[PDB]
Scaffold this active site. Sequence first.
Site, PDB file in Angstrom:
ATOM      1  N   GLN C 146      30.615  62.109   5.401  1.00 30.55           N
ATOM      2  CA  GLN C 146      30.713  62.105   3.952  1.00 30.55           C
ATOM      3  C   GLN C 146      29.779  61.124   3.277  1.00 30.55           C
ATOM      4  N   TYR C 332      61.182  30.558  31.462  1.00 31.07           N
ATOM      5  CA  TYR C 332      61.714  31.683  32.216  1.00 31.07           C
ATOM      6  C   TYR C 332      60.597  32.441  32.904  1.00 31.07           C
ATOM      7  N   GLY C 444      74.298  35.880  30.950  1.00 27.55           N
ATOM      8  CA  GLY C 444      74.079  37.323  31.019  1.00 27.55           C
ATOM      9  C   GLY C 444      73.058  37.772  32.038  1.00 27.55           C
ATOM     10  N   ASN C 480      67.287  41.626  29.469  1.00 32.76           N
ATOM     11  CA  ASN C 480      67.370  40.273  30.029  1.00 32.76           C
ATOM     12  C   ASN C 480      66.128  39.749  30.689  1.00 32.76           C
TER      13      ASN C 480
HETATM   14  C1  F43 Z   1      35.761  66.066   7.785  1.00 33.12           C
HETATM   15  C2  F43 Z   1      36.723  66.134   6.602  1.00 33.12           C
HETATM   16  C3  F43 Z   1      37.929  67.016   6.986  1.00 33.12           C
HETATM   17  C4  F43 Z   1      38.964  65.996   7.428  1.00 33.12           C
HETATM   18  O1  F43 Z   1      39.932  66.225   8.174  1.00 33.12           O
HETATM   19  N1  F43 Z   1      38.646  64.813   6.922  1.00 33.12           N
HETATM   20  C5  F43 Z   1      37.345  64.756   6.251  1.00 33.12           C
HETATM   21  C6  F43 Z   1      36.524  63.529   6.746  1.00 33.12           C
HETATM   22  C7  F43 Z   1      37.374  62.245   6.706  1.00 33.12           C
HETATM   23  C8  F43 Z   1      36.706  60.946   7.193  1.00 33.12           C
HETATM   24  C9  F43 Z   1      35.206  60.836   6.751  1.00 33.12           C
HETATM   25  C10 F43 Z   1      34.420  59.697   7.422  1.00 33.12           C
HETATM   26  C11 F43 Z   1      33.089  60.141   7.917  1.00 33.12           C
HETATM   27  O2  F43 Z   1      32.277  60.634   7.101  1.00 33.12           O
HETATM   28  O3  F43 Z   1      32.832  60.033   9.143  1.00 33.12           O
HETATM   29  C12 F43 Z   1      37.666  59.889   6.587  1.00 33.12           C
HETATM   30  C13 F43 Z   1      37.019  58.558   6.195  1.00 33.12           C
HETATM   31  C14 F43 Z   1      38.887  59.596   7.516  1.00 33.12           C
HETATM   32  C15 F43 Z   1      38.512  58.860   8.795  1.00 33.12           C
HETATM   33  N2  F43 Z   1      38.348  59.551   9.880  1.00 33.12           N
HETATM   34  O4  F43 Z   1      38.262  57.637   8.806  1.00 33.12           O
HETATM   35  C16 F43 Z   1      38.157  60.614   5.339  1.00 33.12           C
HETATM   36  N3  F43 Z   1      37.897  61.905   5.313  1.00 33.12           N
HETATM   37 NI1  F43 Z   1      37.772  63.028   3.572  1.00 33.12          NI
HETATM   38  N4  F43 Z   1      37.875  61.323   2.381  1.00 33.12           N
HETATM   39  C17 F43 Z   1      37.765  61.190   1.129  1.00 33.12           C
HETATM   40  C18 F43 Z   1      37.717  62.293   0.132  1.00 33.12           C
HETATM   41  C19 F43 Z   1      37.482  63.602   0.542  1.00 33.12           C
HETATM   42  C20 F43 Z   1      36.986  64.668  -0.438  1.00 33.12           C
HETATM   43  C21 F43 Z   1      35.570  64.297  -0.935  1.00 33.12           C
HETATM   44  C22 F43 Z   1      35.068  65.206  -2.071  1.00 33.12           C
HETATM   45  C23 F43 Z   1      33.708  64.847  -2.579  1.00 33.12           C
HETATM   46  O5  F43 Z   1      33.244  65.549  -3.530  1.00 33.12           O
HETATM   47  O6  F43 Z   1      33.065  63.874  -2.142  1.00 33.12           O
HETATM   48  C24 F43 Z   1      37.017  65.935   0.406  1.00 33.12           C
HETATM   49  C25 F43 Z   1      38.256  66.790   0.077  1.00 33.12           C
HETATM   50  C26 F43 Z   1      38.133  67.398  -1.286  1.00 33.12           C
HETATM   51  O7  F43 Z   1      37.126  68.139  -1.460  1.00 33.12           O
HETATM   52  O8  F43 Z   1      38.964  67.118  -2.186  1.00 33.12           O
HETATM   53  C27 F43 Z   1      37.096  65.387   1.801  1.00 33.12           C
HETATM   54  C28 F43 Z   1      36.856  66.102   2.861  1.00 33.12           C
HETATM   55  C29 F43 Z   1      36.849  65.777   4.292  1.00 33.12           C
HETATM   56  N5  F43 Z   1      37.489  64.742   4.786  1.00 33.12           N
HETATM   57  C30 F43 Z   1      36.084  66.592   5.266  1.00 33.12           C
HETATM   58  C31 F43 Z   1      34.560  66.308   5.158  1.00 33.12           C
HETATM   59  C32 F43 Z   1      33.921  66.665   3.792  1.00 33.12           C
HETATM   60  C33 F43 Z   1      32.419  66.795   3.901  1.00 33.12           C
HETATM   61  O9  F43 Z   1      32.001  67.586   4.772  1.00 33.12           O
HETATM   62  O10 F43 Z   1      31.725  66.120   3.139  1.00 33.12           O
HETATM   63  N6  F43 Z   1      37.525  64.060   1.828  1.00 33.12           N
HETATM   64  C34 F43 Z   1      37.905  61.915  -1.247  1.00 33.12           C
HETATM   65  O11 F43 Z   1      38.128  62.747  -2.165  1.00 33.12           O
HETATM   66  C35 F43 Z   1      37.849  60.479  -1.704  1.00 33.12           C
HETATM   67  C36 F43 Z   1      38.337  59.473  -0.653  1.00 33.12           C
HETATM   68  C37 F43 Z   1      37.621  59.763   0.654  1.00 33.12           C
HETATM   69  C38 F43 Z   1      38.124  59.026   1.887  1.00 33.12           C
HETATM   70  C39 F43 Z   1      37.513  57.654   2.096  1.00 33.12           C
HETATM   71  C40 F43 Z   1      38.059  56.580   1.230  1.00 33.12           C
HETATM   72  O12 F43 Z   1      39.206  56.716   0.709  1.00 33.12           O
HETATM   73  O13 F43 Z   1      37.334  55.565   0.954  1.00 33.12           O
HETATM   74  C41 F43 Z   1      37.779  60.002   3.000  1.00 33.12           C
HETATM   75  C42 F43 Z   1      38.780  59.965   4.167  1.00 33.12           C
HETATM   76  C1  F43 Z   2      72.558  27.580  22.819  1.00 31.94           C
HETATM   77  C2  F43 Z   2      72.358  28.314  24.177  1.00 31.94           C
HETATM   78  C3  F43 Z   2      73.206  29.543  24.159  1.00 31.94           C
HETATM   79  C4  F43 Z   2      72.257  30.638  23.713  1.00 31.94           C
HETATM   80  O1  F43 Z   2      72.596  31.730  23.255  1.00 31.94           O
HETATM   81  N1  F43 Z   2      70.995  30.215  23.992  1.00 31.94           N
HETATM   82  C5  F43 Z   2      70.891  28.822  24.405  1.00 31.94           C
HETATM   83  C6  F43 Z   2      69.807  28.108  23.628  1.00 31.94           C
HETATM   84  C7  F43 Z   2      68.524  28.893  23.578  1.00 31.94           C
HETATM   85  C8  F43 Z   2      67.357  28.328  22.784  1.00 31.94           C
HETATM   86  C9  F43 Z   2      67.205  26.801  22.973  1.00 31.94           C
HETATM   87  C10 F43 Z   2      66.192  26.137  21.973  1.00 31.94           C
HETATM   88  C11 F43 Z   2      66.770  24.878  21.368  1.00 31.94           C
HETATM   89  O2  F43 Z   2      67.132  23.942  22.111  1.00 31.94           O
HETATM   90  O3  F43 Z   2      66.838  24.841  20.108  1.00 31.94           O
HETATM   91  C12 F43 Z   2      66.178  29.164  23.353  1.00 31.94           C
HETATM   92  C13 F43 Z   2      64.824  28.443  23.435  1.00 31.94           C
HETATM   93  C14 F43 Z   2      65.974  30.524  22.610  1.00 31.94           C
HETATM   94  C15 F43 Z   2      65.461  30.329  21.189  1.00 31.94           C
HETATM   95  N2  F43 Z   2      66.322  30.410  20.191  1.00 31.94           N
HETATM   96  O4  F43 Z   2      64.277  30.098  20.937  1.00 31.94           O
HETATM   97  C16 F43 Z   2      66.692  29.439  24.763  1.00 31.94           C
HETATM   98  N3  F43 Z   2      67.961  29.196  24.941  1.00 31.94           N
HETATM   99 NI1  F43 Z   2      68.789  28.779  26.808  1.00 31.94          NI
HETATM  100  N4  F43 Z   2      66.924  28.650  27.707  1.00 31.94           N
HETATM  101  C17 F43 Z   2      66.587  28.323  28.925  1.00 31.94           C
HETATM  102  C18 F43 Z   2      67.512  28.123  29.988  1.00 31.94           C
HETATM  103  C19 F43 Z   2      68.853  27.946  29.780  1.00 31.94           C
HETATM  104  C20 F43 Z   2      69.781  27.312  30.813  1.00 31.94           C
HETATM  105  C21 F43 Z   2      69.413  25.823  30.973  1.00 31.94           C
HETATM  106  C22 F43 Z   2      70.192  25.162  32.149  1.00 31.94           C
HETATM  107  C23 F43 Z   2      69.761  23.713  32.379  1.00 31.94           C
HETATM  108  O5  F43 Z   2      70.381  23.096  33.318  1.00 31.94           O
HETATM  109  O6  F43 Z   2      68.856  23.157  31.700  1.00 31.94           O
HETATM  110  C24 F43 Z   2      71.170  27.531  30.239  1.00 31.94           C
HETATM  111  C25 F43 Z   2      71.907  28.705  30.877  1.00 31.94           C
HETATM  112  C26 F43 Z   2      72.319  28.328  32.286  1.00 31.94           C
HETATM  113  O7  F43 Z   2      73.075  27.326  32.413  1.00 31.94           O
HETATM  114  O8  F43 Z   2      71.898  28.997  33.279  1.00 31.94           O
HETATM  115  C27 F43 Z   2      70.842  27.840  28.799  1.00 31.94           C
HETATM  116  C28 F43 Z   2      71.788  27.745  27.841  1.00 31.94           C
HETATM  117  C29 F43 Z   2      71.641  28.035  26.408  1.00 31.94           C
HETATM  118  N5  F43 Z   2      70.661  28.715  25.862  1.00 31.94           N
HETATM  119  C30 F43 Z   2      72.608  27.444  25.433  1.00 31.94           C
HETATM  120  C31 F43 Z   2      72.410  25.923  25.211  1.00 31.94           C
HETATM  121  C32 F43 Z   2      72.526  25.098  26.490  1.00 31.94           C
HETATM  122  C33 F43 Z   2      72.703  23.617  26.174  1.00 31.94           C
HETATM  123  O9  F43 Z   2      73.677  23.339  25.405  1.00 31.94           O
HETATM  124  O10 F43 Z   2      72.012  22.764  26.687  1.00 31.94           O
HETATM  125  N6  F43 Z   2      69.524  28.229  28.630  1.00 31.94           N
HETATM  126  C34 F43 Z   2      66.923  28.105  31.329  1.00 31.94           C
HETATM  127  O11 F43 Z   2      67.597  28.151  32.380  1.00 31.94           O
HETATM  128  C35 F43 Z   2      65.452  27.909  31.530  1.00 31.94           C
HETATM  129  C36 F43 Z   2      64.577  28.559  30.452  1.00 31.94           C
HETATM  130  C37 F43 Z   2      65.110  28.150  29.091  1.00 31.94           C
HETATM  131  C38 F43 Z   2      64.547  28.810  27.853  1.00 31.94           C
HETATM  132  C39 F43 Z   2      63.257  28.253  27.330  1.00 31.94           C
HETATM  133  C40 F43 Z   2      62.003  28.631  28.127  1.00 31.94           C
HETATM  134  O12 F43 Z   2      62.052  29.663  28.831  1.00 31.94           O
HETATM  135  O13 F43 Z   2      61.026  27.865  28.067  1.00 31.94           O
HETATM  136  C41 F43 Z   2      65.698  28.672  26.871  1.00 31.94           C
HETATM  137  C42 F43 Z   2      65.804  29.855  25.881  1.00 31.94           C
END
Ligand code: F43
Ligand code: F43
Lengths: 442, 442, 548, 246
Positions: C146, C332, C444, C480
């Site tokens: 176009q 983790y 979990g 998980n």
């Molecule tokens: C190949 C198609 C069929 C199809 O599925 N999509 C096309 C082409 C596609 C391509 C053209 C890019 C390129 O040139 O490589 C893109 C940009 C979409 C894309 N793939 O990125 C596009 N149309 Ni078209 N298309 C447009 C339009 C239009 C208008 C253009 C009429 C004119 O007199 O110039 C007519 C439809 C109509 O007659 O109403 C039209 C047709 C067509 N549209 C005819 C090609 C027409 C030609 O042979 O010149 N588009 C528009 O009416 C304005 C917005 C414009 C879009 C780009 C933008 O929004 O900036 C573009 C939107």
């Molecule tokens: C509040 C929860 C309950 C819940 O739904 N998620 C928590 C907390 C959440 C927060 C902790 C961020 C913070 O401190 O603000 C995040 C980072 C998730 C988040 N919101 O971005 C996380 N756990 Ni938890 N959580 C982790 C873990 C764990 C281990 C930690 C055990 C230890 O002895 O330190 C235990 C579960 C278990 O006992 O097996 C655990 C518990 C818990 N997990 C207990 C808080 C424990 C505490 O009071 O100290 N996570 C892990 O076992 C290792 C990876 C680690 C995660 C961060 C990372 O992957 O870098 C984090 C993953």
Amino acid sequence: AKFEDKVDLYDDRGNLVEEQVPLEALSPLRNPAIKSIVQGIKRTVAVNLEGIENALKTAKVGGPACKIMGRELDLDIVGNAESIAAAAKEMIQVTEDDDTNVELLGGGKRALVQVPSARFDVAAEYSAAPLVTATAFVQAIINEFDVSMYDANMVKAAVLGRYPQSVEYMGANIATMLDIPQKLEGPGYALRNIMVNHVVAATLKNTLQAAALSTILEQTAMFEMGDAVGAFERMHLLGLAYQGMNADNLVFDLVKANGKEGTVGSVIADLVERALEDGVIKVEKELTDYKVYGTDDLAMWNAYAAAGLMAATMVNQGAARAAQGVSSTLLYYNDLIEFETGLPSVDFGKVEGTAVGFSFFSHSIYGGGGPGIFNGNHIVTRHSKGFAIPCVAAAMALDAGTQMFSPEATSGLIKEVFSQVDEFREPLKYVVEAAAEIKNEI
Amino acid sequence: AKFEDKVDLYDDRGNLVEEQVPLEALSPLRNPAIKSIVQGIKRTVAVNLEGIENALKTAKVGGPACKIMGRELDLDIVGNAESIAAAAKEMIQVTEDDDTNVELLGGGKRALVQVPSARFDVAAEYSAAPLVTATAFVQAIINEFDVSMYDANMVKAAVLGRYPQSVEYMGANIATMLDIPQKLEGPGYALRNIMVNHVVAATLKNTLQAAALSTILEQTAMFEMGDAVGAFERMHLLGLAYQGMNADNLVFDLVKANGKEGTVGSVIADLVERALEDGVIKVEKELTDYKVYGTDDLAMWNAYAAAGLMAATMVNQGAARAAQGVSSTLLYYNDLIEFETGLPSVDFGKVEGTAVGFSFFSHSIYGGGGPGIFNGNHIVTRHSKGFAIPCVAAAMALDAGTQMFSPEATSGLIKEVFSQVDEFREPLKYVVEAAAEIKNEI
Amino acid sequence: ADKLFINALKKKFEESPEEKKTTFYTLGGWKQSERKTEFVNAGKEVAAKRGIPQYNPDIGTPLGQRVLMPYQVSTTDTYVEGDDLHFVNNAAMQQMWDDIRRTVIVGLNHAHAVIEKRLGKEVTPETITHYLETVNHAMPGAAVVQEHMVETHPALVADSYVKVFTGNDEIADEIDPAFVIDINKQFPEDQAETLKAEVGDGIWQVVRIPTIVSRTCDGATTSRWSAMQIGMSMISAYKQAAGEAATGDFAYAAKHAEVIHMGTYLPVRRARGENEPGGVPFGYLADICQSSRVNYEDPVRVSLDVVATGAMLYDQIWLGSYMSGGVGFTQYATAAYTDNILDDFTYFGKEYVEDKYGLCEAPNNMDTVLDVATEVTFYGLEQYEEYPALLEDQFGGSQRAAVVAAAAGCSTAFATGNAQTGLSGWYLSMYLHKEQHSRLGFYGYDLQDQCGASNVFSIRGDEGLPLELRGPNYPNYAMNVGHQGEYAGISQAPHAARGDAFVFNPLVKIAFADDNLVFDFTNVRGEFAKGALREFEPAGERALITPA
Amino acid sequence: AQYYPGTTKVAQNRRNFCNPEYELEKLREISDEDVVKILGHRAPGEEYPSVHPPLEEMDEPEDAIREMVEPIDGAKAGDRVRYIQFTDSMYFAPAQPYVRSRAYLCRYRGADAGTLSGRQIIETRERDLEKISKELLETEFFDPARSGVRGKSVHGHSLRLDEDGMMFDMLRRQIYNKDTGRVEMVKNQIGDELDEPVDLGEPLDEETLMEKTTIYRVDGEAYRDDVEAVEIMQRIHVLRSQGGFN
Ligand code: F43
Ligand code: F43
Ligand SMILES: C[C@@H](OP(=O)(O)O)[C@H](NC(=O)CCCCCCS)C(=O)O
Ligand SMILES: C[C@@H](OP(=O)(O)O)[C@H](NC(=O)CCCCCCS)C(=O)O
Ligand SMILES: O=S(=O)(O)CCS
Ligand SMILES: [K+]
Ligand SMILES: [Mg+2]
Ligand SMILES: [Mg+2]
Ligand SMILES: [Mg+2]
Ligand SMILES: [Mg+2]
Ligand SMILES: [Mg+2]
Ligand SMILES: [Mg+2]
Ligand SMILES: [Mg+2]
């Protein structure tokens, strides 16, 4: 019945089956064939035994290009398919002789599995089908070959893939028409997340049957989503009937009248003529050389316009034998019909808006793809409430080979298994028969 | 028929109801009361009419602290509740004599809604309950007051919240025991995503009924997940019977014997003695002053150990009348019993592991909370396949007021509506009755 | 001769490593530490400038009643306070994650099929080279079609580019070598042959988007950004209409049909898109680390370089920030890559296995698990008992549990040549350690540990999976510290012992064999030390567009 | 009950701590007031705060389980749940973290016990906690040099001992007095200064630490030489492994 409307029902050849059936006999809530289709889609799984065997012998499990060197297992699964299938069936069934089906296909390379409906009556959703199937086949394979504890996890991987590290069954060797519940764009969307290519594959590319299956799934989702509750219910039922079930032969007759020489525009003209002839619309006022049409029944106008939309797709994309222009038909049928009439287009603009995005996302760099990869759950094509996707199904059924991501490419496993099921393959036949059967109970 | 086991079933007072019931009469796949409970949980919605009214009057819609100045609408919803509920019911039902229930509670401040079971039979999942209920009440409120097109979107926001901008019904004034399908940790998990506090609220804190309801939901999910298919099925059924149904009065009798002065350790000693007396375990080997126990029936050992686990929770948290130590009971009952016997603990270490994380996540900065906010879908508590969460429900039933996030805080809407339903409130009664009824069909 | 941790213990403490007694409370708290002193002063200045109190060593409890230790980065001669290993304070650590997050692998196999079969144009090494020149202009954010486009500043996005690889040597050699990852140059002969056989005639792109973009946005940006510029470059290089129906096949191919993400998306409680740490399976992490292609004569070195990669990413950045934050989890993780402790224990186990079995010669069964993991566990625990300085160093039980069990599990897998029995040995180690010392880790720590034995060999839906396919989203593992990076090491162990070129995905392995990356994946522990010393130069800075 | 396998003194000491019929050896006398001061939850003469009303004041419906389980006295009263937490040195403290949690759930009612490497905690109703705490503090659960009462800042279980034989404490809550050879508690468990220190008696000598310890070490009794205890741990591992598979 809540509604007064009746429709005449036809077969996929355009011949009358039953006159004057109440509209609600076609409702997903009432029609037993729609119930059996939906329950069948929930419970059916394609198992690729050859895929499982190959994954095991190469250790290629867990998704594209993945492999674990040293884990290979050479098991003669396809050679032992009968025993494995029978053992799986014993685990899958609830009781002996219930509605569980396990049927080998392709000389043991594939299995059709239908998990018993009773599992679903005590389930929240539909994932029991892949999950029960997968584990029954995993266990049957392990038990067939006495696979050790140390190795059995590879069987599991070969069957179901990288699940549960992936959310999906990534790399699985089973397939369903449905996809996982987490992928729904909204609650209630599951029957929408069914790739258009899968519908076209299951119906063997019969245009009317693909349109019917797609409409059934979309409009059934509209009930599950609550969209077809209360004020909107009749609109949705009339859409189902006229756009997807060829009610009154309207789609068929518009295609007949326009198929030899017609265009989207000629279909529009015929539909407007027919709506006026039937009293669906009327001239409301006269401007200068221009009639402004009104309607006293917006849901019926919407349904007639939706039938015309389907017929315009069949005419336009049927003439090209190339599906891509369905996005254009969905747009300009609606845009043209509004300026033709002064009435709102199908789904009050939502088909036209879906079509704008769908056209963009099937001709641009940004996402989407070809028509066949869309579905009612896709973010691009979810917006119309059932009135767009069935036209895409009809267009893909008519595509003669212009697509890289064709149903042959995306949906071969689904085709081989799901097309076996009569009600999936010819739903227009079964839903019409069922509606006629219950016609005096509605 | 598949399994020879029989169990004796009791009421929540420890009286025998039915002896020698086949194990499969308690299966979710067979027991009609479990089917009725599960379909009931899919279809039931609590509607907070007062909450909708207040959200509208203040324009406080779309989630915590949210408000749209200038959008306030003052509608007499509670005063017109009967009319609104009737109009909603007409949209919610499929037919006039179906199983739709819409019942006002609290002088019209709340409604119990049970969406007809038939909508679910043609649905993929369960979201039709909230979505059909929500739109029916939105439409009924709009129609009651003739709310204009310009204002009606506020009614929608008051009922269902920020959906679909949010994935959940954020700020909704309806509630269900289930949660949206996108929140499942895996396919098949929906009956697990039910807050412990909701189970305790629905069962009015009756300890045995809470444990029963939770077990029914958990073990039913295990079927939907495929976990209870094939090799594991008997393990799951015996868990349901012995841990959740008080089979053979084992839980009850252990509590009776240990309630006055007992500890987790004294319950363990009694359970090991009982398992020995019943021939579930036997001495395999003598070390130096230490008997190594074995079993020829791991599923049965697991079930006895699970009954002991439940009893230990009831004794330990019942004595404190404080639920927090359930995480400790779940851990050290299992750790102690393995070193007491040389046999694996409940769920082969998975309860103990769930308990380690649950202890950490209920006593640390990192997540979790008090026991009542967990559920089988929670990442901390999903790992045991049904054998941990019912103990948490028993513990919260026994909590006398030590929790900030208590069922009174989290589950009041659910309590008012869902405890009205007899089979939700007293499931142990209904499931035992249905098992006794079908005992000769197994 | 001496145990490998002795030099580090002698650096940390005045007493000999065996000495049982010390004296505390005499070091001035934080004043003993150069780093804490720098922090106290910096906090004074921060607080004074901004008008809000900040770091204050007198809030809460007084650090440094004991020695605040330096840590030796294992395999190096660099000793630093642990604060220099916090990811926030270590630009090498940040860049390691950026380099993963901003990479995707994208096939050209469907794309070339679309060109041939649908556009009806030929693909040859020459056309591929022209495409690559085009996409190397476009990928960093510059225009090709176009008029009136506004573009990214090339110097802000210098780290973004596209390379390709293929297993066909003659095709590889015909593409301009500026764009090719040369498998024969980067890998020793036998590994090269394995990798080329896996790839075959497939042709794959390795796309790296700009670090500045990845930092502004997220990992799920990567495959989208990649696809947009692949799409523009296919338009320009193969002379398409600029937006026709076939354009959507390139989009679907690059975004879905032939993309390999580094990480898959996560479920809602931990919602994230693709290319976030939790979605990276352990076998991919082992493949990303490049120790395998340079230290292949030493399987201990290979395995423990993977442990370092993963302990840092998974515990410090992922669990300690994405999933928590604050002070976080530096130590983790450092327990697994400092003081040569894990190295001492794992060399012991490797030698024990060599003597009793021979590497990869032991039966793949529970007998081997019991033998090796028990023996190695006891060696590691004896070291903490013999050397009080060692125990005061790895002061948290979790740290000790992870280190001892990593040596036991890696050693078990060195014996069997199979990661699953390695994993069983990890869990047995925890059980023995818990009984020996009547403690294990934090509150979990052993959730997965107690589920562990039963889930190693399970086949159920959300339980059964080979270790290589597991990752931070495997249910038991989702929460998980002190496990995930060690599991990546166990996943690497049997493959390093077998001489396998990769652990789980050969495309991922090749995709990081590239000196145009900013972080040097061949020497992860050396890079961590360089960052600790404040000597690492990351990409993504805004200096060119901000005041001098 | 048999509690724990093994033939060492360590193993017998683990069994003795768990067995409520084993009389814990009393090593020191501490007054009620001093237990209260060390706990740090309330002041001398302060009434027990409550978290909820007394059980008798509640209108609880019939519940067979409630009816069968006698509440501890503090639960009857509505007392807060409070804690006591200990850290045990790996240099042969008598009790150790899992030993404590295992023992507490054998000996005490209504107990929430938590084990960690560096800290071990019990939470229960306040008046009952005070009675339990006296026994934890007066008996062979506790040595005043190798164990510490610590509600925060727990580091030290794995550290070298100081020259007096005392465990590290960042907050120095327990101070060894050379003039008496006795330890005094100078802060409560959270680290606040006590008005007057509490005598905790003399540290156990090396011989007595070795008689009483529950940790296995190479320089005491090694776990690997208690072959029967190792056998049971290995057995558990194998049976869990097999059970999870089939
Ligand atoms: C190949 C198609 C069929 C199809 O599925 N999509 C096309 C082409 C596609 C391509 C053209 C890019 C390129 O040139 O490589 C893109 C940009 C979409 C894309 N793939 O990125 C596009 N149309 Ni078209 N298309 C447009 C339009 C239009 C208008 C253009 C009429 C004119 O007199 O110039 C007519 C439809 C109509 O007659 O109403 C039209 C047709 C067509 N549209 C005819 C090609 C027409 C030609 O042979 O010149 N588009 C528009 O009416 C304005 C917005 C414009 C879009 C780009 C933008 O929004 O900036 C573009 C939107
Ligand atoms: C509040 C929860 C309950 C819940 O739904 N998620 C928590 C907390 C959440 C927060 C902790 C961020 C913070 O401190 O603000 C995040 C980072 C998730 C988040 N919101 O971005 C996380 N756990 Ni938890 N959580 C982790 C873990 C764990 C281990 C930690 C055990 C230890 O002895 O330190 C235990 C579960 C278990 O006992 O097996 C655990 C518990 C818990 N997990 C207990 C808080 C424990 C505490 O009071 O100290 N996570 C892990 O076992 C290792 C990876 C680690 C995660 C961060 C990372 O992957 O870098 C984090 C993953
Ligand atoms: C449609 C969908 O793409 P897919 O069909 O899923 O590949 C979606 N992209 C977009 O919506 C592109 C939005 C920004 C680019 C176009 C702006 S007009 C996404 O990547 O999730
Ligand atoms: C449990 C869950 O927290 P919630 O219970 O959903 O608040 C989860 N956190 C974690 O898993 C914390 C993991 C990192 C900190 C502890 C490391 S041991 C999360 O935030 O999604
Ligand atoms: O104490 S906890 O185990 O909860 C958190 C350790 S970071
Ligand atoms: K970012
Ligand atoms: Mg006709
Ligand atoms: Mg005409
Ligand atoms: Mg009006
Ligand atoms: Mg004897
Ligand atoms: Mg100040
Ligand atoms: Mg370099
Ligand atoms: Mg006294």
